[PDB]
Structures are given as structure tokens and as C-alpha cells.
Design a binder for this molecule. Structure first.
Ligand SMILES: CC(C)C[C@H](NC(=O)[C@@H](O)[C@H](N)Cc1ccccc1)C(=O)O
Ligand SMILES: CC(C)C[C@H](NC(=O)[C@@H](O)[C@H](N)Cc1ccccc1)C(=O)O
Ligand SMILES: CC(C)C[C@H](NC(=O)[C@@H](O)[C@H](N)Cc1ccccc1)C(=O)O
Ligand code: NA
Ligand code: NA
Ligand code: NA
Ligand SMILES: [Zn+2]
Ligand SMILES: [Zn+2]
Ligand SMILES: [Zn+2]
Ligand SMILES: [Zn+2]
Ligand SMILES: [Zn+2]
Ligand SMILES: [Zn+2]
Lengths: 484, 482, 480
């Protein structure tokens, strides 16, 4: 954890073992640029970072006056400083293109804190960084104390929440079992004084969640499944909100086995479920005025003599029958039954998160999540809020032609499309078949298969897990409640 | 089971139901070529074998004056006679380009290996009428040399055939437990110390890389860590031989295609060779303390299988990012090499059917030698080649070493590149060799010649016993200098 | 280019706009480390480079006390300074034998400026133009100028090869290759013959012609023959290079993943052109012939085919089963041409097999042949010159794998294993008995072109083969 200290003082009078100065749009004119000549001599033009050794100033370029760009640079700066021997760094308050001040303060604070994270638990050479603190001089680069206090609280809560999700998603599958997911949820419940229910395969059987159970059949005797149900219930609740996540702690494809090149990183198939656990932590600690339910269907999708099969026809909890033609479309089966369980809560809003389809990633790229559903106003609110939080998102539209592609000749619906095209969307349309008529205008489906796990550093994300979904959904709920 | 009888007599005065005469480099001039006109009449030009029916003489061609080609020809000759009705064959003593002792070993070994074939499951299996080769101690171009060569031939034939029978055993039968049983027999035969450890011992020693490979099949065929010890009255060196005993390798969750999974019963080639080596080295009575270490397990697929993305803590302590479960042998070896080093040996050699890339690079008939110590690598190569095995050194370099980095562990069990697989596998093993052992270590990748689906040289279809002769010759030459 | 000035002065007294200091094996004790505590403060421990801003000193780490790593670091140091605004750098003399170290430093430094950035719009001229070498030992003048001459010639020669190999295939045609060879011949006053398809027809080089058939009417083939003939020649040496200016695999078409980078299939032929330039400028005492068979291997309605049976110039017939084994067909005929010259030594260079790259990795070339002494000489000399090499052994089992039921030999192996070696054994079929002990085959499929920076090589072409064959020829002549 990078500690951030707010101090009522000029940047110049603040004390720290080094300084951080951002260069926005190649503007080197500010008083905080102490030795402009050194930068010219070594040809620093505001791209990436540059360290003035004599003055111990780290400059960090921000290409455009942009909050999103600010968050990224602040992260890079701390990553850079993490490998050095300075115990502390001081920085002033910036106000880039975004109200604006608060969002700029949030981006600076979160960015800085996120620069310390890397999944290095298993590396033998790992070092504790010397860098422990950032001193924030409450002075404008261009009430401030109140807004900085508000942004620091957000940054503290969101960093913790993001890092919970990332440590879990990054956890290797021999360790990160469904039972392990439940234990992480149990800690979060105890920390936040939440209600938690952890159900097993017998509960699933009693509730007739046979789609969920089918996916688990191969591995039941090794790693039994867990239906994790977290509840945050404050004194004033303006809305009941259900967050449903795909908790696939390992997806090998089942009998429809994945090729080796595609099976690697599937420890991250619990990205959605993990994001939901982090969301209950964030929303509880932010004390939002809503009753929030976190529902995670956790299981592996393994191969073995008891595995569910292409040609199986499963009776969903909702009652509809499902022709299985490919066991590698397992997430939507777990989700079919978890969404059904969710609707039994009679929520006002349902949002599911899932690393659901490769086709989403092909369509949007690795860095962007897809938003699906019927209510355009609701989808727009999630998109607008999520983009502001710094996540990349795109709506994908249903249509009636795609809907026909998941027809089955021998069941009510097929777990794959008859076409090679439109996979993210036909998957969302599969889920729709399990959304009751009275919840169709209250449901969002978010496919985070891309950004939940990426094998390189990008933006505020280190190699591996990113915590995709958490910032966007938090922003969406806050904006939702502001209107209620 | 081909008895060789040495006789103080001329080739002509020796008695047997038929004769074997080698034709070297198409030279038909020798007195032993009894009816030359017959060979002309039927266009025998010294390629392969030809049987003079009236004189009951089998001619066997040796294309060049070469001791290796003589070994091969002797094998082919007996293979030919095995199918006939002569109980005995007589042969003289030959001396091709090598020397006398080397040539006698070639002849006697070649002849004995001619009888071997894996026909255990054939319903039309026939026992051979051919039982003996009478060797007339007369030079084509001694008794002390012949005796010494016969001893080697007898021990090496037995040793190679132990290994070949084990490697050829199909996987339903040839389990890790089965390997341990064969090791027990060899230990009992040679009065060796033997330890057979199970998964509980593996857990105690934190050999989690080894354990991970076995997890899919633990409840079906549990793993075995086999440890043989030969300890002579005089021991000039302490030598640890480490073998990959993968009794089946389906690739795990990173499942092999069907065309590539067939023959993987032979993924126990390296561990099997180590078992045969303890037999050979004990009976030869070499002046070295020899440890044979075999990590035996299957690599199966199932709901408890270890996975791409698993990160395993090796016994040595280094963490391993698994990105492909079909790179399993190097995990088992990482832990078996750690166990080996705790013995503080002077020399460590490992044998493994480890990479397809080795076979692509060298061909199916040649094993790769890797390591740091050039004198030690050269000694294995020269000794090995002299013993009749085909070998090649493959060099490490710093560029290949970077390719097994991991972003989230100390090392990755696969390379980032499609190129140089045999050598990056070697460099993976290197990460588990302590500094104080790096100049005492050889890695031998026998993925090619350990199992080949045709007859070649002195090798029948299937298992060849690769690594046994070469490592024997290496140890003998090593003890000469000590 | 990077000018190197040798100056008889101390490192301290030498003048340049910045300094270069090597840190060998994390030894920071030397006088030239001007401000130690700065390195401590910023956790520089001698890996990669570090720039002392105040003193304008670039430190470059050398992990071990090794001449090869010195070569590498020197290159990295200059790549680093190239992006900066200093016009000159000064460096002392290092010894990680003295001649060998001086050659590595000077070559290393000069190779630091090479990038294939011809088609980049943002390319800007470098400020860095000179390295001032203070003739003072870290731990001489005659060795320095000897190493400087080598470095200058070898940098020129390597960059000739890399520019050519890097040239994209629409431009880098067989005619274009012959043009680069014409420039090298004119520069060095060499004898040069450039033959076309009519000459190939007359010489019955039908294996070569077959590969060219698809694209004859677009880019005709060229047989390039350079001759260096000095006043004193102790040996006659033929250097034979595969000049496939593009290899799409022909009818046996390559998938997209594998076709990209095949502009570099002229790696071997390009290496031979650079060799002739190096060996002539070094004035070695040997008559050296450089023979390059240049053509594309394209697909089209006139393409040669799997099932074609070709009559080589040597006379042996070849069953084609895969048109993507085209290099060995060009080489079969070029080797025949080479042997007619009655050389004492023949070395061929070719980016010939993927199997070689699979077996050895991308950074190492394979050496094949019969004469162990000749192979050991090439290997040892090449390793000292800074190239990574391995010998691959023939054997009789592999030789059987290229038999044909309907021709004298097949242009592919019947097995998926041992491809670099069975390719060598295919070439062997066209080497006369009287040349078999005078022949080396070098498969540079790996390091001739690599899509990243490594050692002294920038992205793309490396100039593989040139340094090693130069060192081998120089060492060969010592024995004569
Ligand atoms: C078989 C298809 C109909 C469905 C299939 N979906 C899956 O395999 C999901 O279970 C995968 N978990 C989807 C995924 C892909 C890439 C990165 C993260 C997650 C897909 O390929 O999209
Ligand atoms: C996944 C790859 C990085 C490693 C993989 N290696 C293996 O599958 C080994 O376990 C095989 N047992 C190696 C082998 C290949 C061919 C013949 C005999 C033995 C290989 O393909 O070489
Ligand atoms: C068809 C095979 C017998 C031969 C085939 N060889 C070729 O395609 C050569 O013409 C290629 N030019 C060899 C090559 C491969 C990879 C990188 C650099 C160079 C090969 O794949 O090795
Ligand atoms: Na992803
Ligand atoms: Na094999
Ligand atoms: Na290459
Ligand atoms: Zn799946
Ligand atoms: Zn999945
Ligand atoms: Zn394997
Ligand atoms: Zn294996
Ligand atoms: Zn080709
Ligand atoms: Zn080619």
C-alpha cells in the first residue's frame, strides 16, 4: 500500500525524498520544472518519464490534458519510483480535462496507489520497495481539502478492492479452487460485517440448478462447487441490486477440450465472480444507500469420465431445457441458473459479469468490455459511468436474426450458436432466455473476457489480472443512487 | 540367449551346423569364401546377406572396413539365421577399422542382439532353433581379449534387453509400480541397495513439481521415486544417474494429438536406461559408487490434472510457471536432480526422452548432449560414439536462456519461441542445478533413438536401450583418469 | 558511420562531449567511475546502461569479463548515445587477446549505429559521429590500428549484407542482387560475371531453372560470379550462396505466418557478396570465388511441381515432392558450377531449413560436412569471431531417408525428423567424391534474420556468416 498524505502547503515547501512533476501536452513552462536545460540536453520531450538526478525530480509526461491520461501517468511514475531508493515522493494537485477537480484527484490518487501492484508472490527475488509514501501538497498546478479527502477515501477503498480481485484472479488454479473463492468472500464478509451464505452441490440440487451442476460434474469429487451469496444491507436502501458473476476457477473446455495455446490464462475465468466479491467490498466501505447482493457461481469446467457431454440436454432452474453441443460454452450454463437464483431476490437491478466469449475479445479488443441488455437508458448509464471511471466499454446490440441462431431442434434452446459469427451477442441472447419478463428492463450483461486478464502491462494494470468491472460498476451504482 | 563358445581352433576345423562369413568392402578373395562362382552366378555383390545352400555358408556384407558396420552385420546375420533350422553357427575373428578388443566386443554384441525381438504378444511366436555361435579363435586378417569381450557382450546384452523389455512393455502393465519391480529384480540380482519411495516421501521432500505431474493419475497409478545404489569395495568416483520414468505421457490437459501419443509408453526410456546401467555397471564391477535415480509416473488427463497457469514450487525452491502440461518430464527431473544433488555426487548425468525438438534437429537415431563442462561433454561424446551410439553436442547460449523467463514465477516450463526447444529444455534443467554442480552435470536427450518404429543398426522395432552402452563407456573412461 | 579516432593520450585528458565507461562483472572500483554514490543512490548495479547526467558519463555493464559480452555492450552503448545530442564519445581501452578485445570494442561500437530505418518517415540524422579512443589500458598502437581496419571493413561488409537482406522483395530482385554485386566488384576492382537463364540452360542447370519457372517472365534468374584474385594465392576458395530473393514455397505454398520474413531467404547469397568485399579489402592471400544463385520461388501457372523429376547439372535426377524445398535445388546446380573451378575449399551458405532453427534456436548456425578438421576450423574460428555455431553430424540412417523410388534422390526426407541434416545429405549427393573432403555446408536459417534486437544485431538482417567465414579463411591461410 502506498500511503498518501494530504498536506496544507505549497509544493515547494513540502518535504519528501524526491519530487514528481507531470508534463501535460509537452508544456515545460511551469515553475515546478526546475532545470529545463537538463531536459533539453538529454532530449526529453514529455514522452514517458525522465529523472532529473541532481534535483531528484521525476517528470511524467501526460500527452493530453486528460484525466484518463493522468491516471495512467501517475501509475507509471510510481512503478518507476518503486525500483529506486526514495522512501517518499511529493506531488502537487493537477486538473486535467475531465465535477472535474474531484475526478482529477481520484485519478491522481488511484493512479499513484496502483503503481505499486504487481503479482510477484511466487518470484524468489521479490523486494519490498523503499517507497512508502506520497506527499500531496494541496496546491493547484493550475473546497480543495474536502474534495481531496473525498478522492483519497475513494482511492484507498478502490485500490484495496481492485487488489483483492486481482490477487484472487491471479491465484493459480490448484490453489484458487471454488472453496478458495468462498474463503476470500468469507474474509470480505467478516471485514465488512456482511451476511454471507455459501451453498454447496446439495443446495444446487434442491434448487434444481442442473445447468450449473452439469459443468461441475467432471470435477465434483475433486473440487465441489460453491454458490456464494454476499449481502450488504444498510439502514437506508433506495434500491436492491444483484451482482452476478461467473466464478469459473478453471476452464479447460471440458470434453470439448481447449487447445493448449488457448487454455493458458483460464485461471482468469473467475474474473466476473472475483469482480463481484471486490464490488461488495467497495460498495460496503463506500456505504452506498442500497441493498447489494453478490452472487457467484464457482466451479471448474474439467474433463473426465463423469463430465457433461455434447448431446446432453439439461433442465435449467428456470425450466427451459438446454441442448449442449459444446462443453466449452459452460459459463452461460452456470449463469443461467445463477441469474435465476438472483431474480428470486426481486432486485431492482441485475448486472452479471463474465469472461464469457472469445468473440467479444475478437470484436472489441483485449482492453474493452461489452455491455448488453434491453433497457437503453440503463445500458447508457453503465457505459457513461464506466468510461468516466476509466474503463473501456462498448454496447453491443441484440437483434432478431441473431436470436434465431441459438434455436435447438430437440430442446428449448442450444448452448451454442449455429453460426461462427456474433458469438458475444448470441451468448447474451442465450442468457436472455433465462431472464423473466419482469426483469428484462432491469438487466445488464457485461462481457469482460478481454480486459479481466491481459498478458502485459497496460494503463493502470500490471501483467495478468486487472480487476475489470469493479470501477465501472461502482461508478454505475453511485450514479444510479444519485438519481434515486 | 545366444551362447557364444570360444574355441582354440581354426575356422575350417571348428564344427557347427552352418557358417558365417563376412564380406568386407566387397572383398571376396579370402580362403573362407568357399564357392565364389555361386555368388557370381546369383549376383551377390556383398550387399546384405546371402546363403550358400550347398555349403551352408551365410555371407554378410560389411560395406566399409568399419567396426560399427561389423556390429550391425553380425546382428543382421543372426536375425537371418534365427528363422532357419541350424542349431549352431561358426564364425572367425574379424578386425575392422576401429582395436582387436573393440572388434571382438562389436562381433559378440552384434551376434547376441540378433536374437532380440519384442514378440511377447505375438500368437505365432516361435522359439529359435539357433542356440550357439562357435567362435574359432583365428584371425581373418587374442584369447584374453576374446574372454574380456565375451564378458562385456554378455553383460551388455542382458542389460540392453532388460531396458528394451521394460520400455516395450505397454502402459496398462508398465506402471510406475512395475518399473520399481524391475528395479527390485536388478537390485536383488546384483545385491544392490534399493529404496522405493512413494507420494508421501515426495510430499515430505517438497517435490511438488514431480507431484504435480502425477496428480491426474495418483489414485490410479501412484508415483515411484526409485533409488538404486551400487557401492563397490573401491570407489574412485560417486556418480548419480537420473532418469525420466514417464510410463505414459498423454500430454495431460495439453493433450497430445493421436498421431503423437502413440509410442509414449517409451517415455520411460531414460529411467529404464538408468535401471539397465546399474545392472551393467555392477556386473562390470566398475570402481565407482553409482546411484540410479528414477522419477516414475504417468502424465494423464483428468479432473485432478495439474494445469496451464499452475505455479509449482520445486524442491530446490524455485517457482515454475506451467504454460503447457506436456512439458512434464522437465518438472519430474527438476525434483529428481535436486534429490540427486543432495547425495553430493562427483558427476550427475540425466537421461530423458525429453523433447520433440531434439528429434527434429538431430533425427531419430541420435541423442543430444548438453551441459557446461566441455571436457565432460567431450568425454561422453567420444566414449559414446566408440560404444556405437550416435551423439551430438548442442550448445547453450545467453539468448536461448532468456526464452524461459516468466513474468510471474522464477522460470517457465516452456519457451516463448518455437525454436531451440531441446536446448531451452536443457536450460530449464540448468535452473535447478546448483552452482557447485553445474560443472559436474550432463543432460542427455534420448527422445529420438530410445524408441524407433523400424529396425535399425542392432535395434529391433521399438525400444533400443539407448544411453546404456554410451554411459557405460563414459564411466569406464572416466575411471581410467581418476 | 561511426568514426573512430585513436589518440595517444589518457582517458582523462581525452576530450569528447560525453564519456563511455564499462563496468565489468559489477566492479565499480576503477578511477574512471567518477561519481560512485550517484550509482548507489539510483540503484545502478551494472546491468544495462546508466547515464550520469552531471558528468555526462554513460556506464555500460558487462556481466562477465568476456570479450563477446564487451562487443555486445559497446553496441548497446552506441545505440543509446545515438538517440542523444552528444557529437562525440570518449572511451578507454578494455581487455576482457588485446587485438581480439580491440576488434570487439571497435566493431561493437560501430555496429551500434545500424538500424534498418530506410522506410521510416520519422528517421532523423544522428548527432553522434565520433568515438575518441584514448590509448590507455583499463587494466598497443599497432594492435589498435589493426583492429580499426578490421572493424571498418567488417562493419562496411556486414552493413552491405544487412541492407541487401532487409530490402523488401518487390525491390530486392535477382537483378537487384546482381547490381549490389556489381557495385562491390567495381569498388574492389574484382572480376565479375552475371549470367542469365540462357546461360543456365546451356549449362543444363535444370534444378535452378525449375525453381525460377513460375516467375521467369517477371524476374529472371541471375547466376552471380565474383572473383578475387590477389598477387599471391595460397588457396582457391569457392563460396556458394542461396540467393532466394523471395520464397513463397511455390505450389507447396507457405501459410501467412511462415511466409513473412522470407525476403531474407537471400541471406546466404548476400553473405557471399559481403564476404568478397571483406576478403578483398583485407587482402587475404587466396583466390576467392563468390557464387550466388539468385531467383524467387513463386507460385503461378508455370510453376515447377510436386512430382516433377529434374535432371541436375551433375546429372543425378531429383524427384520433387515439395516445391518449398527449393534452396537445395538451386544449390545443387550452383555447387556443380563451383566444383568446375577446381577449388581447394568449398563453403556454402543458405537459409535452408526450418528444422535447423528448431534444433539449434534462432541465434545459431549449423555446420555440416565430412572433413572433421575443416568443420572444427570453421567452428572454432567462427566462435571467436562472435558467431554462434554448432556441428551437426551425418549418419547412414539419415542418408536413406532421401531415397526416391523413381529418381536418383528425393528433394525431401520421408521423415519429419532431422531435416537440416537430410538437407545436408541431399547437397552431398551433388558433391563429387574428390570434393567431399573439401566441403562445408552452413545453414544460417536461424540467425540470418531475426525479428528482434540481439547481440550486435538490430531487428531483421544480421549479416550472419560473414564474420565467421572471414575468420575461417584467415585461419586457414595461416596453416598454408
Ligand atoms: C465455444 C464457444 C461457443 C464459447 C467459447 N467461450 C468460452 O470458452 C468461455 O468459457 C471462456 N471462458 C471465454 C474466454 C475467452 C477468452 C478469454 C477469456 C475467456 C468461446 O470460444 O467464445
Ligand atoms: C510442449 C513442448 C514445449 C515440450 C514437448 N515435450 C514432450 O511432450 C515430452 O514430454 C515428450 N515425452 C518428448 C518426446 C517427443 C518425441 C519422442 C519421444 C519423446 C515437445 O513437444 O517437445
Ligand atoms: C519442405 C521442407 C523439407 C524444407 C523447408 N525449407 C524451406 O522452406 C526453405 O526454403 C526456407 N527458406 C528455410 C527457412 C525456414 C525458416 C526460417 C528461415 C529459412 C522447411 O520447412 O524446412
Ligand atoms: Na482477457
Ligand atoms: Na523415438
Ligand atoms: Na531466421
Ligand atoms: Zn469455456
Ligand atoms: Zn469459461
Ligand atoms: Zn510430454
Ligand atoms: Zn514426456
Ligand atoms: Zn522454401
Ligand atoms: Zn527457401
Amino acid at each position: 500500500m502506498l500511503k498518501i498524505k494530504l498536506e496544507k502547503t505549497t509544493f515547494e515547501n513540502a518535504k519528501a525524498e524526491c519530487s514528481l512533476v507531470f508534463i501535460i501536452n509537452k508544456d515545460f513552462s511551469h515553475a515546478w520544472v526546475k532545470n529545463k536545460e537538463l531536459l533539453e540536453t538529454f532530449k526529453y520531450e514529455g514522452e514517458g518519464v525522465f529523472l532529473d538526478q541532481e534535483n531528484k525530480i521525476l517528470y511524467a509526461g501526460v500527452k493530453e490534458d486528460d484525466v484518463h491520461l493522468l491516471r495512467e501517468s501517475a501509475c507509471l511514475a510510481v512503478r518507476t519510483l518503486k525500483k529506486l531508493a526514495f522512501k517518499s515522493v511529493k506531488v502537487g494537485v493537477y486538473t486535467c480535462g475531465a465535477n472535474a477537480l474531484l475526478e482529477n484527484l481520484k485519478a491522481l490518487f488511484l493512479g499513484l496507489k496502483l503503481g505499486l501492484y504487481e503479482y510477484d508472490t511466487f518470484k524468489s527475488n521479490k523486494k519490498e520497495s523503499v517507497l512508502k509514501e506520497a506527499i500531496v501538497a494541496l496546491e493547484l498546478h493550475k473546497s480543495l481539502e474536502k474534495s481531496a479527502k473525498e478522492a483519497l477515501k475513494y482511492a484507498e477503498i478502490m485500490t484495496e478492492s481492485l487488489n483483492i480481485v486481482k490477487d484472487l484472479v491471479n491465484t493459480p488454479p490448484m490453489i484458487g479452487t471454488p472453496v478458495y473463492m468462498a474463503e476470500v468472500a468469507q474474509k470480505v464478509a467478516k471485514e465488512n460485517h456482511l451476511e454471507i451464505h455459501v451453498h454447496d452441490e446439495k443446495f444446487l440440487e434442491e434448487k434444481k440448478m442442473n445447468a450449473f451442476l452439469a459443468v461441475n460434474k467432471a470435477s465434483l469429487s475433486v473440487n465441489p462447487p460453491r454458490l456464494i451469496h454476499l449481502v450488504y444491507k444498510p439502514k437506508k436502501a433506495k434500491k436492491k441490486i444483484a451482482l452476478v458473476g461467473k466464478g469459473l476457477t478453471y476452464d479447460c473446455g471440458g470434453l470439448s477440450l481447449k487447445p493448449a495455446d488457448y487454455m493458458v490464462t483460464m485461471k482468469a475465468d473467475k474474473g466476473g465472480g472475483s469482480a463481484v466479491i471486490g464490488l461488495l467490498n467497495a460498495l460496503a466501505k463506500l456505504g452506498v444507500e442500497a441493498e447489494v447482493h453478490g452472487i457467484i457461481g464457482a466451479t471448474e469446467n474439467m474433463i473426465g469420465p463423469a463430465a457433461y457431454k455434447p448431446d446432453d440436454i439439461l433442465i435449467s432452474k428456470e425450466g427451459k431445457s438446454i441442448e449442449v453441443r459444446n462443453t466449452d460454452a459452460e459459463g452461460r450454463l452456470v449463469l443461467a441458473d445463477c441469474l435465476s437464483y438472483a431474480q428470486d431476490l426481486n432486485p431492482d437491478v441485475i448486472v452479471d459479469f463474465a469472461t464469457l466469449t472469445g468473440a467479444c475479445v475478437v470484436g472489441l479488443g483485449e482492453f474493452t468490455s461489452a455491455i448488453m441488455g434491453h433497457n437503453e437508458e440503463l445500458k447508457n448509464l453503465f457505459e457513461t459511468s464506466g468510461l468516466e471511471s476509466g474503463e473501456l466499454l462498448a454496447k453491443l446490440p441484440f437483434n432478431r436474426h441473431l436470436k434465431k441462431l441459438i434455436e435447438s431442434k430437440i430442446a428449448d434452446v442450444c448452448n451454442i450458436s449455429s453460426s461462427r459469427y456474433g458469438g458475444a451477442i448470441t451468448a447474451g441472447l442465450f442468457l436472455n432466455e433465462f431472464i423473466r419478463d419482469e426483469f428484462k428492463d432491469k438487466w445488464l450483461h457485461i462481457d469482460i473476457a478481454g480486459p479481466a486478464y491481459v498478458e502485459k502491462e497496460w494503463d493502470v494494470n500490471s501483467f495478468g489480472a486487472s480487476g475489470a468491472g469493479v470501477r465501472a460498476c461502482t461508478a454505475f451504482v453511485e450514479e444510479l443512487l444519485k438519481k434515486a
